[PDB]
mmCIF file of N, CA and C in Angstrom:
data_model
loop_
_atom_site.group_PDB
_atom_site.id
_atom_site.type_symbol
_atom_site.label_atom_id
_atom_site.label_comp_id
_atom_site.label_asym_id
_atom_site.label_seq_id
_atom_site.Cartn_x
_atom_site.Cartn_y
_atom_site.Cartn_z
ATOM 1 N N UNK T 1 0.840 -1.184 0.000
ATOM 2 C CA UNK T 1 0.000 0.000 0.000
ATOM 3 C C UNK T 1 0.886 1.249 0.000
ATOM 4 N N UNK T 2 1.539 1.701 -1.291
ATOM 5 C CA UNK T 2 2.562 2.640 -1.550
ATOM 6 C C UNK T 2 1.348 3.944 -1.374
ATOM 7 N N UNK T 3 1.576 4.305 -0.275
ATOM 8 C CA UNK T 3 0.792 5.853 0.182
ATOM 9 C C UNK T 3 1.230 6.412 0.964
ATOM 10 N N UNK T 4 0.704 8.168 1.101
ATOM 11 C CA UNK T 4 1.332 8.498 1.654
ATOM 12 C C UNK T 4 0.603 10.249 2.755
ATOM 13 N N UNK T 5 0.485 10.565 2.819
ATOM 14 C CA UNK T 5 -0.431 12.020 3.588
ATOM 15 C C UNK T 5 0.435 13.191 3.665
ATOM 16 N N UNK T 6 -0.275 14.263 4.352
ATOM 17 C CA UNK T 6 0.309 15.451 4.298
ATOM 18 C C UNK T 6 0.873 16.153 5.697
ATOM 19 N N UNK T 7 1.784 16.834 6.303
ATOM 20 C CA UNK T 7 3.260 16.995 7.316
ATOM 21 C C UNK T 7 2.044 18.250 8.033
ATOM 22 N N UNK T 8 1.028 17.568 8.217
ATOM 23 C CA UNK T 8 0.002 18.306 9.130
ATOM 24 C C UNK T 8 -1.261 17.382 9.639
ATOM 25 N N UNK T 9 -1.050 16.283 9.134
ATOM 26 C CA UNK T 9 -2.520 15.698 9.649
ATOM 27 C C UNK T 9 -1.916 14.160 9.838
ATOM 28 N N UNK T 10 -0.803 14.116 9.169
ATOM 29 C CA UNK T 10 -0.034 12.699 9.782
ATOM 30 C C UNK T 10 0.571 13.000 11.271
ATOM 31 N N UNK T 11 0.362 14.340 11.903
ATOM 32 C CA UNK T 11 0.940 14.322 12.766
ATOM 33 C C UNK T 11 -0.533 13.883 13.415
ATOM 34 N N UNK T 12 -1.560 13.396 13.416
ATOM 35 C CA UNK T 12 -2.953 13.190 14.192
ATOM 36 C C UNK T 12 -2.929 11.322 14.424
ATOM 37 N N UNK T 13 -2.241 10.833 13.751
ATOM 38 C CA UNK T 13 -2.220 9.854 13.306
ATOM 39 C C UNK T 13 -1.345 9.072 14.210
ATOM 40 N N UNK T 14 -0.256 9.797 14.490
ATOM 41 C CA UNK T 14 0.966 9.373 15.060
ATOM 42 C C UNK T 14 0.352 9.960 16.810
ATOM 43 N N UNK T 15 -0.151 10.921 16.802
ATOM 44 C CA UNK T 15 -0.630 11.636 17.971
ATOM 45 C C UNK T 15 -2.102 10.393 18.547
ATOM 46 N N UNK T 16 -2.120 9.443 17.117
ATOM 47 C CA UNK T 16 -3.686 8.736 17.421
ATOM 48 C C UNK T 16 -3.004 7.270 18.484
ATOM 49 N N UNK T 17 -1.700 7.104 17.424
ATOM 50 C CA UNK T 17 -1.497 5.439 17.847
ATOM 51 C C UNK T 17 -0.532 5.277 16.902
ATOM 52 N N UNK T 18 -0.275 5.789 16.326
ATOM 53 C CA UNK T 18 0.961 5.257 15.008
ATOM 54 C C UNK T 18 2.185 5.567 15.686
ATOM 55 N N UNK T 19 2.596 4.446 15.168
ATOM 56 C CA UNK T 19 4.042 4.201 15.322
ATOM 57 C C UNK T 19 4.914 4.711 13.989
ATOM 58 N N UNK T 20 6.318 5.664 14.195
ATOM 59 C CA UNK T 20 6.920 6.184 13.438
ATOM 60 C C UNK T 20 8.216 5.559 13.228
ATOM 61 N N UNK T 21 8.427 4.668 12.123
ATOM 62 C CA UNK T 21 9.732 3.725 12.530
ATOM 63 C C UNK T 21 10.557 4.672 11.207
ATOM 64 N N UNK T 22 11.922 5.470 11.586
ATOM 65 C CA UNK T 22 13.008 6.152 11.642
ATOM 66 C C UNK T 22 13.631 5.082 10.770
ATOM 67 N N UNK T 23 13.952 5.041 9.501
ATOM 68 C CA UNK T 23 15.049 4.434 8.353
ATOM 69 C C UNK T 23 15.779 4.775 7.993
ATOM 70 N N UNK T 24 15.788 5.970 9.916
ATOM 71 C CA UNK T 24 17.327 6.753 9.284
ATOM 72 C C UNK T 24 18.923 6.523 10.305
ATOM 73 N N UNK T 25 19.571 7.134 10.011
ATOM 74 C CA UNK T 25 20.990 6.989 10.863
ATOM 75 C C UNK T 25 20.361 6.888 12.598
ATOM 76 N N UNK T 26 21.351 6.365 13.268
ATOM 77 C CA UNK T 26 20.826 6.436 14.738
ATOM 78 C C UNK T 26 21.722 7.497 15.560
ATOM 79 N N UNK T 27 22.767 6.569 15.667
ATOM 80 C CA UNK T 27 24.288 7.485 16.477
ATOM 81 C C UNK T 27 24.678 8.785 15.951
ATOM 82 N N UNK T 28 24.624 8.996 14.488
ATOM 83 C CA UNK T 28 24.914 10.268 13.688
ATOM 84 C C UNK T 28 23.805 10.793 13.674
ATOM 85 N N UNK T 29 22.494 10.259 13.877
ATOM 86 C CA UNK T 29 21.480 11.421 14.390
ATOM 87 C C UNK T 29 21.364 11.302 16.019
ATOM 88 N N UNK T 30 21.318 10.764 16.731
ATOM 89 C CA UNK T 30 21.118 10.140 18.371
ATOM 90 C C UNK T 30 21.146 11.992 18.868
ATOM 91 N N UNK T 31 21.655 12.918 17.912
ATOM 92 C CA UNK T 31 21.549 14.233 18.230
ATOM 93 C C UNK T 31 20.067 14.962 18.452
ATOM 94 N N UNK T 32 19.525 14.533 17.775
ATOM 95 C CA UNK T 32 18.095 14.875 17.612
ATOM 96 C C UNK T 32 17.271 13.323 17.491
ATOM 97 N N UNK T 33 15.870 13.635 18.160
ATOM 98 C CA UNK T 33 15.154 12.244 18.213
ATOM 99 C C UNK T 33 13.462 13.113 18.026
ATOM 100 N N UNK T 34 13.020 12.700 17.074
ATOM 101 C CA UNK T 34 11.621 13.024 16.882
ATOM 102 C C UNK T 34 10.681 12.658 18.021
ATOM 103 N N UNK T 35 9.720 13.079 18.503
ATOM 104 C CA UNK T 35 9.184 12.961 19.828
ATOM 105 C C UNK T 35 8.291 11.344 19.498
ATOM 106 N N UNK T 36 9.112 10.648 19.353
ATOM 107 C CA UNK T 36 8.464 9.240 18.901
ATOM 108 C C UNK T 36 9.243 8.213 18.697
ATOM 109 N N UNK T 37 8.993 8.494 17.053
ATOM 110 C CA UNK T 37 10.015 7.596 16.081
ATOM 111 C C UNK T 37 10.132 6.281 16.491
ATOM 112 N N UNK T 38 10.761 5.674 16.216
ATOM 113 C CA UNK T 38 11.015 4.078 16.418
ATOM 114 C C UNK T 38 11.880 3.239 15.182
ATOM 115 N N UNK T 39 13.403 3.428 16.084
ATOM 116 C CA UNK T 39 14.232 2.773 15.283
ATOM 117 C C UNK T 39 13.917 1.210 14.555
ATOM 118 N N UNK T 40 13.970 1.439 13.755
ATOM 119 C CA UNK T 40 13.707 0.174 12.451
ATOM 120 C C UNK T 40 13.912 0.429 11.143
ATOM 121 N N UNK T 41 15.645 0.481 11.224
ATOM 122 C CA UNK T 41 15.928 0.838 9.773
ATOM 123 C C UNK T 41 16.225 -0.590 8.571
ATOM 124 N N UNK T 42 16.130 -0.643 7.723
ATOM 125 C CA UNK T 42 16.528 -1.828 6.643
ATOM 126 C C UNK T 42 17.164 -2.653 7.411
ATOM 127 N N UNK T 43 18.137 -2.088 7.923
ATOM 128 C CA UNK T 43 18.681 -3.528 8.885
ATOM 129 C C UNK T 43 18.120 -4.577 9.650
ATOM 130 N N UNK T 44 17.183 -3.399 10.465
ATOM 131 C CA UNK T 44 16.791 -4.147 11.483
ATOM 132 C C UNK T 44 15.135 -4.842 10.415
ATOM 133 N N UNK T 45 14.204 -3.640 9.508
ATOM 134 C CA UNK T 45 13.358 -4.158 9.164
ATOM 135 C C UNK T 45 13.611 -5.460 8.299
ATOM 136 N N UNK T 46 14.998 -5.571 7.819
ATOM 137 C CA UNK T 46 15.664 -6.973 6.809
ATOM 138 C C UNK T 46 15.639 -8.019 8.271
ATOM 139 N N UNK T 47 16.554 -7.893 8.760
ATOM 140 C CA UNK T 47 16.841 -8.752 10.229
ATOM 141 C C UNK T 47 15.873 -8.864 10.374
ATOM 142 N N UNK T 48 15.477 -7.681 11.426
ATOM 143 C CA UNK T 48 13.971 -8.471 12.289
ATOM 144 C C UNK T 48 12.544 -8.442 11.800
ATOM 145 N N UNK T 49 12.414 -7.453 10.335
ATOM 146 C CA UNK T 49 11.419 -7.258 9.820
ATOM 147 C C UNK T 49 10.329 -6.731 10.336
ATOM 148 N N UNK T 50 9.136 -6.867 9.732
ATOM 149 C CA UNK T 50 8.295 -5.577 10.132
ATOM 150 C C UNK T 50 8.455 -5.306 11.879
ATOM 151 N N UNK T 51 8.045 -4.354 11.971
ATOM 152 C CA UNK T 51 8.011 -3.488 13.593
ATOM 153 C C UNK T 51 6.811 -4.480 14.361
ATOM 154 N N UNK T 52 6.620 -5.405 14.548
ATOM 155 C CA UNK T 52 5.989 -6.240 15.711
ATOM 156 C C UNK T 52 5.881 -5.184 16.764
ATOM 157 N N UNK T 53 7.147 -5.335 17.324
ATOM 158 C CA UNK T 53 7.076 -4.696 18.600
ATOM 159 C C UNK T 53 6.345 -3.245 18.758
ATOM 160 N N UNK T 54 6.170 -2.433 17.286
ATOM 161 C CA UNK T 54 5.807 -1.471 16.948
ATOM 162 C C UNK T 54 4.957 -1.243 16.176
ATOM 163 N N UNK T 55 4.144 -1.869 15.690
ATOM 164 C CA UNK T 55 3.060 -2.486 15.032
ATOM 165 C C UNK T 55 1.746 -2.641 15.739
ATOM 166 N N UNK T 56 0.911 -2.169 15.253
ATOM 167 C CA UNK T 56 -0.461 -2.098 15.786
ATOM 168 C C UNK T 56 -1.879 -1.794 14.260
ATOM 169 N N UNK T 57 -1.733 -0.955 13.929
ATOM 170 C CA UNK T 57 -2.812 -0.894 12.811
ATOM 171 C C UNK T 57 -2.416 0.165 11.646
ATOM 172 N N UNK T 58 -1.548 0.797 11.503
ATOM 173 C CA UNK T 58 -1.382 1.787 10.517
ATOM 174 C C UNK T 58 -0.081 2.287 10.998
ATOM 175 N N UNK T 59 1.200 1.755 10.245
ATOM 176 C CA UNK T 59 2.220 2.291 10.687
ATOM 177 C C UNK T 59 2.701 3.217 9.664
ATOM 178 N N UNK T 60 3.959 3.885 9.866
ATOM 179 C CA UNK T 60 4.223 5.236 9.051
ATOM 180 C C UNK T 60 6.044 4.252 8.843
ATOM 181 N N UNK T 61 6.280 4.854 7.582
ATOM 182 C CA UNK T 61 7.572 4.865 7.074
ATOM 183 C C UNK T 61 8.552 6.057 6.603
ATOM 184 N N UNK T 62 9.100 7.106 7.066
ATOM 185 C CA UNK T 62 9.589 8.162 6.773
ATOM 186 C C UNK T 62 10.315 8.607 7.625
ATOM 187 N N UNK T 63 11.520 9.646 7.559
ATOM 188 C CA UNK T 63 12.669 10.258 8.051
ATOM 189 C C UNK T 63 13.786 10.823 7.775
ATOM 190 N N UNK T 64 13.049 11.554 6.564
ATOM 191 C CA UNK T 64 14.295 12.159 5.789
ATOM 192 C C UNK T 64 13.361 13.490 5.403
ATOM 193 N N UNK T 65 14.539 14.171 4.488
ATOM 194 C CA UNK T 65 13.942 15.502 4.276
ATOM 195 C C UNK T 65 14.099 15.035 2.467
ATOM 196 N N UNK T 66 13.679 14.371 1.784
ATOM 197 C CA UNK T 66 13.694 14.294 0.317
ATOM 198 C C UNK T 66 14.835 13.661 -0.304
ATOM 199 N N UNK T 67 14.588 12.008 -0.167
ATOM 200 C CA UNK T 67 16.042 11.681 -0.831
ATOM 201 C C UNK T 67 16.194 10.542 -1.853
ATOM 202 N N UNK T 68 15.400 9.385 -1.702
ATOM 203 C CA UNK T 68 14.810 8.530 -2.436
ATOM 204 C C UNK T 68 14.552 7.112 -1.400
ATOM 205 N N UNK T 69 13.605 7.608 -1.078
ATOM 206 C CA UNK T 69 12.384 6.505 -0.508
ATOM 207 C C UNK T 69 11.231 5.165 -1.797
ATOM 208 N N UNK T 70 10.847 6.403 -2.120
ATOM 209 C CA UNK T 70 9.848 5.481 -3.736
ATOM 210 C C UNK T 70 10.610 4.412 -4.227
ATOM 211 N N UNK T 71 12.216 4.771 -3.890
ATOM 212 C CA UNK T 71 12.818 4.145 -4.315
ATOM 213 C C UNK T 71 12.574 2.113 -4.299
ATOM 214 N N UNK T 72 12.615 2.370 -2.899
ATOM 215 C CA UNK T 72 12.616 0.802 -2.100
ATOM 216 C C UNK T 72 11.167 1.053 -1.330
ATOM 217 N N UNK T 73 10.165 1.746 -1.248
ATOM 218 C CA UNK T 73 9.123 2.097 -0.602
ATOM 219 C C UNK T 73 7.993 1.508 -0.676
ATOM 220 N N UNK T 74 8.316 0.020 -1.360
ATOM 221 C CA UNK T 74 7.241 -1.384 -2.050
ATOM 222 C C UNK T 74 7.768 -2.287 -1.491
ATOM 223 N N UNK T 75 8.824 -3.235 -1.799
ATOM 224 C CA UNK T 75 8.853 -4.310 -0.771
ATOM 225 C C UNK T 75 8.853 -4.029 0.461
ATOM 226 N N UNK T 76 9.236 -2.510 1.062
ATOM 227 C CA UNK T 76 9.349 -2.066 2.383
ATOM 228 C C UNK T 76 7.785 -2.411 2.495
ATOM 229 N N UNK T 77 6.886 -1.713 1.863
ATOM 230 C CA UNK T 77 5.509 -1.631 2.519
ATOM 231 C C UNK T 77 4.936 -3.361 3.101
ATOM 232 N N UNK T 78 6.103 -4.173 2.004
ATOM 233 C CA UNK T 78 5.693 -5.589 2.388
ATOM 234 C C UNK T 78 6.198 -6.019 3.463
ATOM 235 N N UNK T 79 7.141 -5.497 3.624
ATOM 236 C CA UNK T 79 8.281 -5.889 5.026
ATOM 237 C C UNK T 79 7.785 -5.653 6.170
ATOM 238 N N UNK T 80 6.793 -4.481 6.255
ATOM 239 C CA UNK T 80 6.295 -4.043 7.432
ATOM 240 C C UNK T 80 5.224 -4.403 7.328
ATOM 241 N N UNK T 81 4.849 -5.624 6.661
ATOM 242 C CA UNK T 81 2.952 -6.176 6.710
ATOM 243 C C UNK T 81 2.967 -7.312 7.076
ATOM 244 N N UNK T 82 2.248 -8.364 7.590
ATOM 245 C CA UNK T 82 0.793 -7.632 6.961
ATOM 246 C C UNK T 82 0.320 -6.139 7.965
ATOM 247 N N UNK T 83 0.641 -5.178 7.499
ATOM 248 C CA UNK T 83 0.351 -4.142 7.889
ATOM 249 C C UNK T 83 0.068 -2.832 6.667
ATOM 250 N N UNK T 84 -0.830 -1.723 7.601
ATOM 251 C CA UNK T 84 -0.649 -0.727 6.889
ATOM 252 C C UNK T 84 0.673 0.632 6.721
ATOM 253 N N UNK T 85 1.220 0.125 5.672
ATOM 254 C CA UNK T 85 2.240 1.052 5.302
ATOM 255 C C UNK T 85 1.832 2.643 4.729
ATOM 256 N N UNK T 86 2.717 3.639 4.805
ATOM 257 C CA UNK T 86 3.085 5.195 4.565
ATOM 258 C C UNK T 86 3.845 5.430 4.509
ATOM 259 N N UNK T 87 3.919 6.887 3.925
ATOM 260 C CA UNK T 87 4.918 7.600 3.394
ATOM 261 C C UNK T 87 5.003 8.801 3.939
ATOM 262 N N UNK T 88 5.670 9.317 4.745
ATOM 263 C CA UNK T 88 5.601 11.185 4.451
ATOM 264 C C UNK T 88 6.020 12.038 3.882
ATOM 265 N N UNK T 89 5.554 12.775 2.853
ATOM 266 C CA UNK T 89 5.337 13.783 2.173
ATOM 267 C C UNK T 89 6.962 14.711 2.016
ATOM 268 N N UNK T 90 7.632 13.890 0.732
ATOM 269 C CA UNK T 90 8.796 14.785 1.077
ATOM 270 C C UNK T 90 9.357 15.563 2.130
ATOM 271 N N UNK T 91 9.834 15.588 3.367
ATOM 272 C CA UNK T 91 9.757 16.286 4.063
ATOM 273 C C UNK T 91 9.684 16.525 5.433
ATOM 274 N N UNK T 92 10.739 16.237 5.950
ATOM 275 C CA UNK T 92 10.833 16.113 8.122
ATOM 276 C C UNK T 92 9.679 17.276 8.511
ATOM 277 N N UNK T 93 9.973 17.843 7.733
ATOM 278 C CA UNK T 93 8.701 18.852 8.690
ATOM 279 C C UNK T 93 7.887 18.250 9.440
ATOM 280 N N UNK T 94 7.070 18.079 9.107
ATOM 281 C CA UNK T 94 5.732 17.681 9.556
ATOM 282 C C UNK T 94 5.275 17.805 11.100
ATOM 283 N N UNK T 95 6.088 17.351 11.924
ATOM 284 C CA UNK T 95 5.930 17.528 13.124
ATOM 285 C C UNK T 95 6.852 19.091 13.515
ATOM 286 N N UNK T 96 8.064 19.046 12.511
ATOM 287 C CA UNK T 96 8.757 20.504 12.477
ATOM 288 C C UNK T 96 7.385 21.439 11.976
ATOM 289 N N UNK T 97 6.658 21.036 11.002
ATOM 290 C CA UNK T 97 5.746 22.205 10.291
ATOM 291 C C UNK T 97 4.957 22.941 11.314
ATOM 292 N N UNK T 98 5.173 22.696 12.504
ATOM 293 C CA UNK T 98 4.724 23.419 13.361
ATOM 294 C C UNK T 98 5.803 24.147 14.542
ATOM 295 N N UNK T 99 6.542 24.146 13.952
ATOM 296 C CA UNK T 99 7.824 24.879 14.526
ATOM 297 C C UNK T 99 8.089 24.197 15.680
ATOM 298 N N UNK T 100 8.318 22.772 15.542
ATOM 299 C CA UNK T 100 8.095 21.615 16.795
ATOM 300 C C UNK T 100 9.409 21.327 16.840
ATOM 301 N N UNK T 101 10.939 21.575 17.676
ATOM 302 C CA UNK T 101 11.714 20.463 17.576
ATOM 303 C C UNK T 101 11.826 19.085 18.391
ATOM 304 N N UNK T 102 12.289 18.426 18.151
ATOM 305 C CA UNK T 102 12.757 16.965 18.221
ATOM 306 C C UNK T 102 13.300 17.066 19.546
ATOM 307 N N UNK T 103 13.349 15.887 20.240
ATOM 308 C CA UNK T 103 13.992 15.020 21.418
ATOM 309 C C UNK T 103 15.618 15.473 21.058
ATOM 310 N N UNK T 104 16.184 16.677 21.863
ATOM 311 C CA UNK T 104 17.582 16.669 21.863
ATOM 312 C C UNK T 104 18.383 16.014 22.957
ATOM 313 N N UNK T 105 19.722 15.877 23.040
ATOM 314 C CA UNK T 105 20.107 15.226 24.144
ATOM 315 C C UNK T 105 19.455 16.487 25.270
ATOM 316 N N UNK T 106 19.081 17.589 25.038
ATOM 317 C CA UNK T 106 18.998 18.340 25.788
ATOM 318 C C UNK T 106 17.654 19.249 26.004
ATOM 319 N N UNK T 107 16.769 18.935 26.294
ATOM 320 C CA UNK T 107 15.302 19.310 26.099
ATOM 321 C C UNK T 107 14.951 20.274 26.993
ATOM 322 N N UNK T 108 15.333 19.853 28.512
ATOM 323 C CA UNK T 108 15.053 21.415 29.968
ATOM 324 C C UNK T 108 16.529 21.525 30.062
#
């Protein structure tokens, strides 16, 4: 289910019950952490495959700011099923689109 929503109403989604599994760097990002996310990158979704542990009814696939996802963004949707797979919308914003930052090592 190659789909995908818009970096304002996927944040309702994730705010509902969705789980946000991160296919991106960990340690070279571990700088910033989206107020969520959930590490499960190719590695781990190849290794351990879809997000079980993170898995519930409509999960999200995205964590980049525009780079090539579409790319591999089909067997992924299979990797993480039987589930519902997504995309987000070119673009980290989304939870940024509200001038939101991320889990730093340093938050108070």
């Amino acid at each position: 289910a190659l789909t995908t929503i818009s970096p304002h109403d996927a944040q309702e989604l994730i705010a509902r019950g969705a789980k946000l599994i991160d296919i991106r760097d960990a340690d070279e990002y571990l700088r910033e952490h989206i107020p969520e996310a959930d590490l499960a990158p190719l590695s781990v979704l190849e290794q351990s495959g879809l997000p079980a542990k993170l898995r519930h009814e409509q999960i999200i696939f995205h964590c980049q700011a525009g780079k090539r996802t579409s790319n591999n963004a089909d067997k992924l949707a299979a990797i993480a099923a039987p589930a519902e797979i997504f995309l987000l919308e070119d673009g980290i914003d989304g939870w940024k689109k509200a001038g939101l930052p991320v889990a730093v090592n340093k938050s108070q």
